[model samples]
Target: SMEQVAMELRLTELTRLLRSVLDQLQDKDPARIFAQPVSLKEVPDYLDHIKHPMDFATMRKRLEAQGYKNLHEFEEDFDLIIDNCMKYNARDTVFYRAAVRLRDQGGVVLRQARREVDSIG
Candidate 1:
């Protein structure tokens, strides 16, 4: 008895219900989720100008150990590194990549910082 349009609406409703259930179980904000997966905007095309002197994970660890706890702390080093090494402003780009790097490894970085407090010791 269902028309083609009605069937489509039914499927859409079912999908919404599924998403709501998943979001509830995952403790995720349903409004913030996309049915489609996200992709990075800037995957480097090649190493033409970029050097793989060290991986981002390794470099991020080194920077964190040097007291670069957050994006604010890294702001100056980020500016200086790009200016000295690549001769560029690098502010926006550094911040963008810093966000990606931190999203992946920020927990460990912050945890290490917490352990270093003398008061906590």
Candidate 2:
């Protein structure tokens, strides 16, 4: 009975930690780093879902406003979050995932924006 109780306690604790991972992700919008192309019909649908600092529109505005053409430039404001992810990477699954996702999307946004800027210029 004691062994069973111990096992249950461990399970509960692990469950809580797992739930916490999900909770953190929900609060830290992955879109902060990821972007998706939208169709004309989906423009209104996309605009209906505006979440500041965690949405594409806000991110784009910040990028343009700050004159950031690449991920390195964008890091001026997002360095803390990116640094935390780097510090906890490999040790924390959530942080590692976040870091990789951000790194990928940041690069993508930078490259795409740079191309557009160059084209316009």
Candidate 3:
């Protein structure tokens, strides 16, 4: 029981130090700090004409099922996809573009979902 208590105390101390460091870094650049967890935004109007086969909404739903409920998760998931595509020697730029587009659009969609939930509550 004492060992467990010591472990818990150490966990609390670690969190306290982490929070303090994060606070100091955030003060240097608040937007950069806050933006760390933010997802990418929708593609600009210039990229609107580009088309790809991946359904972003479907991808989002799938990721959500896999416990990726935030922009950071969404982006990281798609980032891996993009990286894999390049690693596999896929010369088809359209597919790559589609994946990137989906990643960006998904962020906007996730952001909207957060806002909607906030408003409802």
Candidate no. 2 TM-score: 0.35
Q: Candidate 1: global Cα-lDDT? A: 0.36
Weakest lDDT window of 10 consecutive positions for candidate 1: 28-37
Q: Candidate 3 lDDT, tens digit per residue, 11-100? A: 555444333432333343322312232122633431243222122333444433444433354445445544543443245765455445
RMSD of 3: 15.3
- Tell me the deviation in Å of residue 119 in model 2: 2.1
Rank the models by TM-score, top first: 2, 3, 1
Find the candidate with the highest lDDT and give its number: 2
Task: Please provide TM-scores, in order, for all candidate models, with all chains considered together.
Answer: 0.22, 0.35, 0.31
| Number of colliding residue pairs in model 1 | 0
Count clashing residue pairs per candidate: 0, 0, 0
Candidate 3 at 48: error in angstroms? 17
What TM-score should be assigned to candidate 1? 0.22
TM-score for candidate 3, please give it: 0.31
lDDT of 1 at 53: 23
The residue-by-residue lDDT of candidate 2 on 9-57, one tens digit each, is 6555434433332234334545443232233374454434432223234
Off by over 4 Å in 1: 28-121
Each model's lDDT: 0.36, 0.45, 0.41
Candidate of highest TM-score: 2
